[PDB]
Design a protein around this ligand. Structure first.
Ligand SMILES: Cn1ccnc1CN1CCC2(CC1)CCN(c1ccc(-c3ccccc3)cc1)C2=O
Ligand code: NI
Length: 204
């Protein structure tokens, strides 16, 4: 229920906390299909070899426009993220969201790598909202790790997000939300898109 989710949940939660989670976003049939497509990209070698950690390598990535052969349902996910944001009108902060990046599909290989603490957009590059879709069936963070931990600015607490199947996450891309991915001991997939604020971007 896009507009309803938008108006009753995503808008008030973002404006109050700046971090929001939607479980069971596309449902398990579409979700599995996205899973399958991401796995096919992995098995057919479309991912990079992974972030040079040490040689130990971490998260493998691939940029996905949405129209590529074999990425149709990823395309569908993207269109559906786009619908959510659009049905938010201009009510996320005072931002006017007019574009987004392609989809970054990330795959942690399960070798104990994660991702160091960072801010997605620390220097005003246009990106106002980070949108992440998780695809990991029966993820148990107690056993496989890979929690996304956010450190909201000015709070003395963590916000730990499990990379659960069919979960969608929004958070502010700027310094309000430093985050890290804790070590992952199982294959962990996520798809991220960033939304641009027209003014910040016209001006980057
Ligand atoms: C893996 N993961 C989990 C949680 N956090 C992360 C890492 N997080 C921060 C670093 C990345 C990925 C996300 C590396 C790519 N990237 C990125 C850079 C530049 C642009 C860009 C530049 C110009 C014009 C338009 C877009 C878009 C995206 C990031 O921000
Ligand atoms: Ni990040």
């Amino acid at each position: 229920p896009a507009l309803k989710l938008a108006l009753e949940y995503i808008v008030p939660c973002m404006n109050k906390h700046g971090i929001c989670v939607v479980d069971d976003f596309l449902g398990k049939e579409t979700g599995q299909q996205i899973g399958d497509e991401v796995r096919a990209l992995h098995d057919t070698g479309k991912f990079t070899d992974g972030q040079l950690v040490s040689d130990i390598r971490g998260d493998k990535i691939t940029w996905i426009e949405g129209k590529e052969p074999g990425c149709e349902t990823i395309g569908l996910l993207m269109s559906s993220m786009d619908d959510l944001i659009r049905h938010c009108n201009g009510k996320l902060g005072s931002y006017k969201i007019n574009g987004r990046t392609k989809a970054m599909v990330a795959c942690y290989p399960g070798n104990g790598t994660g991702y160091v603490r960072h801010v997605d957009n620390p220097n005003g590059d246009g990106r106002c909202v980070t949108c992440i879709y998780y695809l990991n069936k029966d993820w148990d963070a107690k056993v496989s790790g890979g929690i996304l931990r956010i450190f909201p600015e000015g709070k003395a607490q963590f916000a730990d997000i499990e990379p659960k199947f069919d979960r969608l996450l929004f958070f502010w891309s700027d310094r309000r939300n430093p985050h890290e991915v804790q070590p992952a001991y199982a294959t962990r997939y996520a798809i991220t898109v960033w939304y641009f604020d027209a003014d910040e971007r016209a001006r980057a």
